[model samples]
Target chain A: DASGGIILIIAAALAMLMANMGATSGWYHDFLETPVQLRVGALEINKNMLLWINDALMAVFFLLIGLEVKRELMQGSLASLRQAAFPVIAAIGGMIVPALLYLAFNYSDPVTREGWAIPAATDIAFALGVLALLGSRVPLALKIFLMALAIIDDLGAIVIIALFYTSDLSIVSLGVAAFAIAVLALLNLCGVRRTGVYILVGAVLWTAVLKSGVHATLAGVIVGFFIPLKEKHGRSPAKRLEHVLHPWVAYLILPLFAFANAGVSLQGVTIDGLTSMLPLGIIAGLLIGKPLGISLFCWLALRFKLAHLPQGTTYQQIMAVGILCGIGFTMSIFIASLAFGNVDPELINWAKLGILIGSLLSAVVGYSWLRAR
Target chain B: ASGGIILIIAAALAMLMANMGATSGWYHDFLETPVQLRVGALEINKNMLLWINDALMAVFFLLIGLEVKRELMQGSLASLRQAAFPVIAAIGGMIVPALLYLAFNYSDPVTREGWAIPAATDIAFALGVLALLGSRVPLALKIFLMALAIIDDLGAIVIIALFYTSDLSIVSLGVAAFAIAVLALLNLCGVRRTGVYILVGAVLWTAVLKSGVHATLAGVIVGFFIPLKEKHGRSPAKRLEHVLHPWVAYLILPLFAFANAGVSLQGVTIDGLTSMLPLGIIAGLLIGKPLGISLFCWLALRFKLAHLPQGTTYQQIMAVGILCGIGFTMSIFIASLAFGNVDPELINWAKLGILIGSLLSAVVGYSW
Candidate 1:
């Protein structure tokens, strides 16, 4: 929903302000701690609400994406090798080409190299949420194409995170996580079709993953894949887990993440700093890169007679989709986290500026283009 | 599912061994750092694996108990007023009597004092897995009782955490958690009916808890109870959430907990740690208290006209049912954490001793 984006906007604003304001340390610390403690006698448990939000809640979001991913690969847009050719080609092109483009800029600067993959994403939520806002004016096929395309976007994001986003490795933790994965495989081998069991194991696997120095978020994707996909008599793992977790991810997890991660402090803004490479690169990547890359790849597909638009979709509609792809809010913020996670103060500020400028440009351009159409 | 517990045992062993190995300072310095930093072209994340595994996993387990509590209080168990009676009486008479009995000897002893609360729980999974192996078991009633007792056990355990324990203040973190709870309450008030929202909110609450000095196990319970209960019909939020979550809680979560928690060192001799509180308390709480309290409660109700065996449960069935109430494993471990959280090594050791002693008693009696 557009309302979702609005909520996200408000949340991001609040998070930024919370993080930047001098006295907001308590709030930050509170956000870090202060989880509801449920003690029954001596069996006391204190959870970090942030982990609950980031890892647990995100699983639901991941489940929904998993479902969509499955659906697309099956009967939807990605179905039939012939029908998938264009998107697959476009996705490969989009990812490899962009990384190369970004690499070209930062190849000599190792400090900036950690961020080559930051701009290589198109957030499906903001895109679809905006489309939802546009209502009936959009064609159904176009929407479907956009959704599938965004999944491709996510696929690229995940790959980048896995291959390029990890830290100094702990073989021991990696071993444990891998061993947990092995147990999960054993469960699968032994015909263990229990979602509850998977989740518990999933949590352990997530721990092993976090310990291994891999981004914990990637664990969501990895565990998502490992979750049993086979179900007999209409009870697949996806159906079971998605049924349980989707609501949590959609309503609670995503919003909480918005609230926690969105706040930015709006201090110390010089025009050059605002338009620095960080902000300008992100802005250009979202506003200029996504549409250009998507449209160019799409045109090649049509020219080579490799891919057709979904049954009723048109080039104009696809172009609108290109514009719609610009609303890169979630990816931008996440990129900010990844880029600035260990950076100096100036770099962090620069990354934040980049995210703001990129997201704003995408929001404005994508909304106007979709709205006008 | 018992096989799942076997997995949990394996996990606990791993956690203990791995952590110890790391702490031994014998391994590479890599094991020393709490997180790992990945940096290369545009990707950075500090992976806090230890915190997630050690701290967050507990919270995940606690959420299970919370759901069990919510379910028992309002769902299937709520149908019988006496459902509350057996648990209440068990809590009051059996548990209190034992604590009062134990208190006389261990009042000056911090670790021994920790044993009192573990008596309140029932480790139904380990015993029930065994019970399932026996012939002619009444499966339905057995399941129901397991469900009921675990819920009760969870409650008593929670009490110990909030009241029995004390430590450094994490007021800010606690406040943030409270705010999330407030949002959850708002969810209940608005009849949000959306499972996603509640879950996300729960995770946020959990994060706050973890960051705060309090334990993280409470996340699940708070997640389970704070949302509006499902009403009849077309609400996807209500229908889908209820239908799906229980299986995970019962089957998936328990198994995971079992695997992670059941960490057995190859040769930590039972006799060697006989004097140690950890093993003593584990054995005692799991074995001794279950047989003692369950038998007394069963016999008293059967004789003194206090309460009869629940549902269609028979005397043998009831005794077996009582055995399940030994929540020694999870309860004692939690007690240890509560003790250790304040960095009191002796208190933890004592809690461990009682646990072992209680578990031994329960096993011997139940086997007979």
Candidate 2:
């Protein structure tokens, strides 16, 4: 399972390398632009390969996240307010501070400022993988703490996508999506626990959302939340779906998404390209703001006795974990794609470079700092 | 489940309704509606029917391949002697139907291509019939029928890959080979993750589709390569088989039947039904399937090469041979492959023939 994360890292690296390798790069770029269309009578959902990955495949990823969140809220780590406070507080700080930092850098340019949420995410796989590498030096509690916080961070990211990322909305499509959601809710009320039923309707919802111009990935999150966490015929639907989908989301969808989106062709990128306000904003947000906000919030929480540091996790270790959370690989790139999809291609490339550079720096420095402890 | 039978009836009804009014034209247009998928240099443009056949049917074949490999490893067909009767009978079932069809149409190059149409047995429909017989039917007979039908399916897959393939692309073929090798390597390296294998398998599927080989064969190949032994308290192949079975059985196969089974009989003469192509299919399924299956099975038993399945009499096995003649799903599939673009009129005639032949076989076989 850890190897899955490793496979993703390798896939992203390979895609990046191939993207720089001249002749293959053009084909690589064009391949992502290849048009895929699905039509049912007059209804059609058409997108290129990149949008398919971002909109369609990533929806499945969010569905898995949704299921996991449902499980946690129903009976797992987030079942009690006391148990949830630590991670919930950390996620809030993690998202807000980074956004504020990005805003500080890009506030003058209204267009570039829309990317403030880019660094507010944590790559759950990369962060967890780094923790997994430190072995017994890291206690079970810190790992769980990091996991819970990252999951909450994902919830925040989903909220951000739904709220800020949406463009021109079709009221009709939104109505259709609302109807689809009602059907799903009705199925739940009728106690239908079949994963396939939810999936079929979830697909209809996705089509509606795509048409509505709300990023279709949010449809996944919405549907995932509705997946019943209660026991049915001696098995919990939420848990079972999570078990089935976790590996797929981790190994196939995420890696494929990273490979598709992480290719930053550096052919004409100068230092100005790297240090431009957009890239600088993202880099500063992740490197300076992530750990600063997390540690700062935890300090405030402990001071106010609102939440305690996870047992067996020290301030330094949590800070290290917070810094590692800055390895915002998958989710950051996803947000970047959503934010800059219609922007200049050069700008998107520079933003990707900033993500790559900043995330790598975070992983390296965070790992060494934690290992030294 | 008897649900399979209900699915067939529903599809038949839909097909019937699709032939009346403006909705009928809309239904036809819906089926022909184009869906295009692009991945890298590969652009696959296919209609809904092709997606159902090539894409959805691949999952069905993957399920079939899973069952085949499981049975050959540990289930009904695990032993050589236990498997012999069905394997031999299936071969006989396949050969005689084709031969019978060819006998009727060999003089005409166009009609001769329809020879393999009746060689298939719809396992779902046949098993549904077997289930309807209830406790009176021997378990052994059902097992034998299933084994034989699975073998028959394996034969159909080979026939499709070997005979129905289009002109090949070396580049795509090379990519397919590479993807397949990676799958093998993943298995060798003890990669038990079904997701990784599936990811690689998908690449292989795309490559094969672009390679001009029918993409469904990649499904079978991937299913075959799935490791059978339990690695983490469950076999990857079994888990996949379990998850995929109900989906294929309930959704895919039913949708396929509805999509492909429609034969608009608004205007058709008895002479058309009795033509060389229709006559070949009817005779092949109704006459040749039982004759070939029973005769070959008898030979195998008579020569002591195999014995009767436990607690099943020769009459029951022969009756099963009659039921095996219920060539519906795969038969219709083969007909499409054979004559989809070759001759449109003949394809319709063949669909009508398939319906009549399959219905007749089902009724007569189920009752007796």
Candidate 3:
């Protein structure tokens, strides 16, 4: 376990270094320019890289999330209506309260209004990482609560990105995307387990969707919903799906993303540049907004009998848990890219500062507050 | 399976869009910044988004690669040394022929030379999708061949980044990189999995590597050597090998790489930038290089090995396999951001060419 921990840090640091290196930027730029095409008869299936990410890989990410959501619905927190209530209320609270707070901060600026969903998300990876740090000091129920809350919040983010973040809608592309989904549904009904077929057709579908103008990642979520999760041999859905995909997720997909996206530079982080609107919003959102909302949500949930506190966890412990939710390393980083993110030396410096400040505050406050409680 | 295919395509398309949009230069810029620590009593790790992608995720990526490599070596491709030789030779021949062809094109000052290496790579997922079109294809052998070639080419690319492409070198930065590697090795031996200790140690290592001014991805490769592949096993070495991790290699990793890395713009062709040196280099890679190398290697392998053509029997199969080597999408895509690649728009357009021309060549040749 300790060895794995070391590996994670070393890996994170390596990605950070690559992200900031000069040549990495060149790689990034060149990479960003790469195109995607599929030829069908006289018509050409073409993809811009951004559309591909938002439309395709994001769909898979969403698919995974969807599968998680579906599985949770069947046997997890939502298995029972009563069990689902607490996290459901908390998720609603987390989303509304933080968004309202953000709207409060930047409501005057229409540009800032587009980014209201920024603070609502809590990356499962980072939150889990911090929660893992808290160990037995925090209760298991609390962890599950946070996980469910974040998952719901992620659903909210996806909706916003899809419904709101789109540049311009193209009905033709949407039709194409829909056709792809229909094909997938047909294959599912036909009992196709062949991953290869899924991939080939998915490519064409992705092309159509890319043309359609829906945030492509939404496809991941949409596709995930349609995918038949009931296993052929009756292994649990998680196990079977995981049996097929965990290796890919951990090994190839995540790593490829890291290599392609990790290169960034820091030589240009002038002190004054750290105070830009983008960074300020990111910093305030992640650091201040996360804990405030988490604490508020948890308190409200407990007071209203919608949620039960984790066994042996005091109110102080709950606050510490709230603080840990502030660690917005992964999701915040992604959100920063989505909202007011720029690769300019000045804007990048600001984004980096926000990530730094947010991650640090979450790490320190969560750790100490948990220890003290 | 059908869903997975659609999902993969969607992922690739998303990647292409991400690259082409307003965020066009963001990823590249993140990699271009210097690594610095606003170190007071508390050290907040800051760098041009490089720290997040390179140093941090390198371990994540490399470990996965190592796992896949282990699997291919032990289970499938390495099932029989005699059996494995053809695939290995196919891989080596593919690379050597491609490099030799690239050398022919880039030997002079006319083209930016290092791009030759990127051209040699074969994107697994994209190629796999292509292969899926063909009926009666040997799934295991094909996957093995692509996986081995890809991992080998990646290792080669990392070496090129560390040694061949160290255009902006500082002696201090070099020493710091060495120190970082040593610390990582030390942690490997120390057997400390506590996240904090490793984070602090990794932070120190990152600072040194940053100071040394090497590609931070080298840190990722260094980290690849550290993970145990398995947990709490008697033979510490016998852990998660690559074969067990094929899903990751074939599906998620490729999907992730494609999505994040594949971003292009239609306007790049409008600026008259698509025909620049790097773009041409990319064209040469995906279009010319694949056809040239795969055809050459297949011919040589067939001529020399004579009777070793079980998995491949299409008449001009050489052309089909050659198109499979179209590194245009991955290579040009990667080259678009390598430090000195100034004209990314041209390279991206060339990538489009590579995608179009190579796919056309593969479908026609393979279908025939």
Candidate 4:
């Protein structure tokens, strides 16, 4: 999160400001919605730039997420359940509470009920940035706790998006996707360690998945899962691919995505729009449920001695960490996009509005009180 | 042995399969296999045949660029006046075929655009002819032959870019310009990473492909920027060329010949062969090529503009002129681009002309 995270937020603000230019809304909308198509004989794939950014580049983002998740579970903080206990419990509790809290306000409106998973995320970049801002006041142990918690939270977010968010499935396309994956696994087992080799085949997987009616991002995740951590006799392809690719993801892709997705028609909203069930529900989850459930579940784990506390990091800092976890900037907006992209597209703007205000609210309240004492 | 024998074999087998009727369907079907890449916002939707011609040919052109760049900087072309003989010979060689082809096709406006089809030479095919015939031939003539064909290809690349590009994506064109700018910046800034240049060059190719330009031009542009020498005096451009040479010659060139040489003969009548398309090509390669080069070379020498290569007589210059008529690959490639879209059915007829014309040249040229 450092400078990259700040730039990402700035891009989002820039997009929002640009859309409010009123005189150039025609140009602004046309700039993103321009149609681009590719055809071969009879097969054609067509989309606007907006969808291209969402479905294509965002898949790269998920791919990076999948890579990081695999590495953490394989050898880092989540290598064992016993070691992973505190974050595991905290992450799960964080997801369940916020989702339930979102559902509580929208439960009566079936139209908005599909977005229950919107708030069940903590954007690791911004959350860590908040923790880092507290410097010496926040214990180093608290930072690890929040990071591990956010990583596990991303794992939860990925599962929900894959298993719950999609709308259609084509058996033919799925078969093709599976066959490509079979070859990918065979490639790895046969000792093929070149990143380019995996990447070329990885594209076949992406194409099939996009047509398979699965979220295109899951194809990226599957491809990432197969990138071997270390070659038997050669250098680490995992490290090389990650080091070169992560900077692009963090600095370019994330910033580009925030700018593209965060724009809204300011005139399209009313003051009462913020008070609607969807926005209020998202706000309720972040401002109230995220902190409450994280602290509550983590406290239960520490109290029963199932998991120990971090290096004399007291209950006060733990509460601040819970508030910091509520800053669900990118990952939360991503889930909200998935939720609304299917059932209703109009609500995504409201979702962005809520996430922007709500996450900032948590960040301010988090350090304000953390530094208050 | 020098890719001549191999190309003929591949081409013969393809022709046999295409005429067999039962397996004929399979040969055509195989070339039509849908090869597409859905990379990010870019999608490449071409058939297997096009993948060999456009994508694989891009690499072939890259190798050509590397060779041409080296010759310009340190070898045959170090001084412009030093290569005046081949340079003048190539211009005359190109202009004659083009003008001759136009003369036959001009009465019919529909056939005029294909003027570029026969206005070039194939280096591998010509060299293979030379390798066999010139085992006893002059050393001076061989250098002349290589430089003549080398200069000849630059015209083909220019004609394709300047004339063949008719397509769009003003936005697409902008990206191509930006990609070239990036490539030029890297070259000037002394960036030694060949991989980065290649990857960025691929971006230019895809953008140019969508922009309605002949996309293979990106390879030459990319190749020109590849540093001639590394910090330690090792060269990435030449090193890349060394590795890619065998692959392009033995596999890619033969594969292209195999794919492009097959012309369905069922409907190929005397009427088809007599038409302006094939007739123009036949006359261009067989009659126009040798006459133009010999006429131009003799004048250059007699006028004191250039001297003949050592141990080479006017007879050998005539031999070299006929050998340049082995314009097999470039002729067929441009034929496809020319008639393939204008009158799709006539492409086969154009192919027939290229094969017959180049065949006659190889035989008659060797006898000299």
Candidate 5:
């Protein structure tokens, strides 16, 4: 996990370097612009490397996340209301405060307003990865607290994407997606535990969703939720799939996404560009909004006796965890892609720059604060 | 393994299907149908056949790489003395066959480029035929054939990259180099994740494919960088080898064979069998392999450089040497590369030669 984070950092940095370096930026830009087409007769999905990474590969990542969420809801950390209360509540605060802050800056500009969700994301992998560096100096409770918070944070991000980011829906394709979902549900009820069967049907659902003008990734989550948790012959399908997919998602898919999406051309970024509503809102939303909202909500929750602070965690550690939540790397980039969606290349670039800057700042501040404590 | 037998059958069926009329056209059309995907500026556009050859075959090479690393580190190839015989025998086996092929075709400048065709051996089919010989085949000889064949693959890979490559792009090459450095850094950071390596490996494969090297070399390079041992008990290289072995040996190799082994003999006449190219490959396998292998072994034994396998006779060794000549799969692949831009009629003829030569060698080697 530690190494994955390190590699993610390196890949993102290399992408940025390539984007800025005059010698190699052209090649990098050219390579990303290379067209990859998938056509089966009349059904043609043409996209460049950027969209493939964002649209297609990210679906797989979301599928894994969906599976994780399903498992957690069933028997893992979020199995009970009491167990889930702290993170779930904290997640609400984490998301709402950042988004509201982002809106406060760009509420008037409709296009720029779409990026309000950018800073509300908490990159679980990035946060855990930095925590891994601190090792035994940090308490186990804090690590567990951060993990649960981020997982819930991910769940919140998924909801936002599905609800707010959809395009013009095609009813027929949506119906087809609905039928595929019904088939998946039937297969689950019939005790059809084969991963391949679910995957094949899920693919149909994905195509339907893609054609339906909804984001294709919603199908991934839908199918993921439908995967039966029933264990047969000593193996649970959901658990097994999760096990097989975890390393791939963590080590490969996420890093590849970062490498593809993190390149921000700094060519035209004046001081005004950096401080403009779009980047500024994202920056303030993550760096300030996240810590403030998380800390304030937890304090309120504890004082009102709605939930106790996690055992062995102090207010300082809780605040540190709140700051760490601001490292919204993966989810932020994903939202940026959905929000921008080829509408404005310049906007996407600035958003990525903001994400990188804000996430980096959060990491440094959180790590140092936690280390001191 | 039974998988190898299935591949053999698939290859035969593909050839038969190709010989038949309506299906042959369908098959040809299917393999040639354009499949193009573009992401950002990176484009991967190729026909189905090239995808199988370029992409799937790279995975096979990766399996080969993993096996090579594992064997060198601890398995049969670990001991220098144990490794020397096959290493020496493989060298002689490759050298003599190439010489014999050149002897037949070198006079014709166009045909001489295929001298490496018969130097390559199809390890799976070779081992399959030997296994069909049952308990009569000595375990040591099987090991010997495997090691020799793997070494031959290594040589074939090198020859393809060094000799056949053209129209190199320096920028892509630099990208490929950086990809390798990233891979090396992954290793240095003690990253044991296979997905991590495979993902980077794919990037490397793309760069190399664009850089004008055969993309399969990327597989070998990626495999070489895979760390054999992890701090935990689970060895990443070994675990990956175990998981991917069946897939490669069963699915990928068989699919490749099915794709490449289909050669139609519709227009060829009897006189074509004796042509310089076909005849050269024929003699290289049917005669060159046994002679090269046995002579190398004899020299090693004569100089006390290597020992005979336990419970194996000289005749058994000779039979094993002949079996090494069954250069069906890899030989056909090299032949395709050698004659890729040549006349289709000539390419078909060369494939015919491979089929006939490999069959004859297998039969004679097995009976002995």
Candidate 6:
């Protein structure tokens, strides 16, 4: 699990190179775009290549993230009001400033303006992976704070996708989704702890959400929130699910995602091409804006004495974390794809380039800065 | 996950749904719903019923494989003393049914393909009926039936792999092999995590599904790979079996019954029931199962290869053999597989055959 980031980075880099390796690029393209279809009687969901990974496999990833978020909110680092303040503010600022910076470059083009939320997302895998490398040099407090912020940003990502990324609302399917949620709530309130019962119902929830014209991953998070963490008699369903799911998400799901989504052909792009607002805006937002927002928010929290720098940490350490927030590889590309899907293939590719460069710079810089600390 | 009571209810609901015009189409459509999945270039496409048969049934088989391994390693089947009688009886139980069915249908290659249909015994449905008799049934007889049915399942698994396969993709088969090797390696390396097995198991399922072998074989294969004796607290194999047992038994098996058991009374006729297909199935399960099981066990007894199950006479063993004729779930499943590419109407007849055969077996077996 600790080496999961390395695996992910390797997979992504492999896909990227394979995508550019001449005739093998055709093979790579076929591998990523091969149509995979499932038909259940009259109902069918057909996905090509990476769509399977994005829509199917990634839901489990979302479910795991959602489960962790609820645990943190209920009883962990983010449970207490005072303790939650610093990271919550940092997450908020981290999101807002990136969007503003993206908007600053793309506001003139309504099509490009739709990508304002791209850099607002963060890749906890790479960032935390980098933080993990600093070993004892990075305080437990700092690591915890970064994780709390990452979880919050993912929560932010989920909500933003629900509110912004979706289209074609199906009222009937939405109703079905709500009905399943109510059932889950009923089960939770009735003190049901059987994980399979929840899992089966959650499958219905996911189906309904997939049909509802909403991004289906929201169902994963919702299901996560409803799993009973508190035990009336024995093992918590939430804890058990979280424990079993963690290794799968970290080791297989995330790496597969990076491999599938990270392939961007660098065929005809140049420095001038990257500077053409969309990709440039993403790089600028992640590289420049993310650090500014995080560090400034933490300073404000400390300035007002609302929160203090975590023990064994300094402003410089927080600044490095702020820099690390720019490593928005997986989540940023995810948003970028949703933002530009069926609109501009060119734009999606450029966004992938920016995410790679931006996240790469952040990973290198954040690790060095922390290592030297 | 449970006894046969819930399965009966679900199947009854499907039957009712099939009859009522208000819900008949809905029921059909619900089972026809398309579900798909893919990894890289590999893809699986199936309607709701096929998906249930392939995906969920694989999980059921996976559970079967886990239990089978555990049993062969340390449970009821671990010792030859306990295993010998049932194992011998089960082989006879399976063989005589096929021969009996072929006696009726062997005139045509088409109908002959369904020889494996009545050869199966539904452990759940049979155990459910046995549970109803409660104190009337001896514990030894019940255990004998269980071991016998377990052996029957192992036979069915093998039959599906060898006979029912349709097409082959060497690439997919190779991938499946590698996945199996990887699964064995994970076990060898003392992997304690179920998720690891599950992750690798899924890859195996996808390949095997695409490999033109029935996907359920992958479930059994992966199930066998699960670590039976680890250096840790609870073994991964048993833990997974524990977790998945109810899911397979209660939800999956019942859902399968509901999907496949929706035989519309609207189509039933005396002639249809009396047709060679239905009659053949009936003959196999109702008559042949008991005859084969009893005959073989008797032969075993005469030859001194095995003894009658303790405190139970040949009469009770014959009744148990008749009970083994209750091939409700697995019979219908095999029927579905056996006739998938053949004439579509054969499936309906097979269902009716299974229902009538299994019903008669339950009544006669219970009475005896």
- What's the TM-score of every candidate structure? 0.68, 0.88, 0.49, 0.77, 0.74, 0.92
DockQ score of the complex predicted as candidate 4: 0.19
- Candidate 3 positional error at A268, Å: 5.4
Error of 5 at A137 (Å): 9.9
User: Predictions ranked by TM-score, top down?
Assistant: 6, 2, 4, 5, 1, 3
On DockQ, the leading prediction is: 6
Compute the DockQ of candidate 5: 0.30
TM-score of candidate 5 against the unseen true structure: 0.74
lDDT of 3 at B41: 27
C-alpha RMSD of candidate 2: 3.6
lDDT tens per residue, model 3, B49-68 = 33443442344344445444
Candidate 1 lDDT over residue span B176-262, tens digit each: 567566656766666544444444555555444433224343454445544434455354334434654555445444543433233
- The alpha-carbon lDDT assigned to residue A322 of candidate 4 equals 81
CA RMSD, predictions in order: 8.1, 3.6, 14.8, 5.9, 6.2, 2.9
**What's the i-RMS of each model?**
14.2, 3.5, 20.8, 4.0, 3.4, 2.7
Proportion of true inter-chain contacts also present in candidate 5? 0.61
Off by over 4 Å in 4: A34-48, A80-87, A128-151, A211-214, A232-234, A268-271, A302-321, A366-373, B1-89, B92-113, B121-151, B163-262, B265-329, B355-368
lDDT of 6 by residue, B1-368 (tens): 24688988988998899889898998877876766665544556666677667876788888888878987878668887878888899889988998999999999889998898888999889988888877666878777787788777767768677756666677877887899899989978888777778879899887666432368778888889888885647788888888887777688888888888997789688888887899899999999999999999889989978866668867888888898888888898888778876787898889888889999999988787
Task: For model 4, state the Cα shift of residue B317 in Å.
Answer: 10
Per-residue lDDT of candidate 4, residues B294-353 (tens digit):
889888988989866778767888787888887788788777666654556677778888
What lDDT, from 0 to 1, does candidate 2 have? 0.80
The model with the greater DockQ, 4 or 5, is: 5
Error of 2 at A271 (Å): 4.8
Q: How well is each residue in A1-373 modelled by candidate 6, as lDDT tens digits?
A: 3587788889898888888989779988877767766554445555565665687766788888778888888888766655667788788899888889989999998889888878887888778877776654557777778888877776686677678666764686778878898899899899888887888898888776563222677777888888889965687889988988887777888888888889888888778988888888889889988899898888888888877566777689888888898988998888887778778668888889888898888888887877777
lDDT of model 3 at position A306: 61
lDDT for each residue of candidate 5 in A23-131, tens digit (9 for 90 to 100): 9999889888777677643347766656666677778887887887777667766556566587777888898899999999999999998777789888887888999
lDDT of each: 0.55, 0.80, 0.53, 0.78, 0.80, 0.81
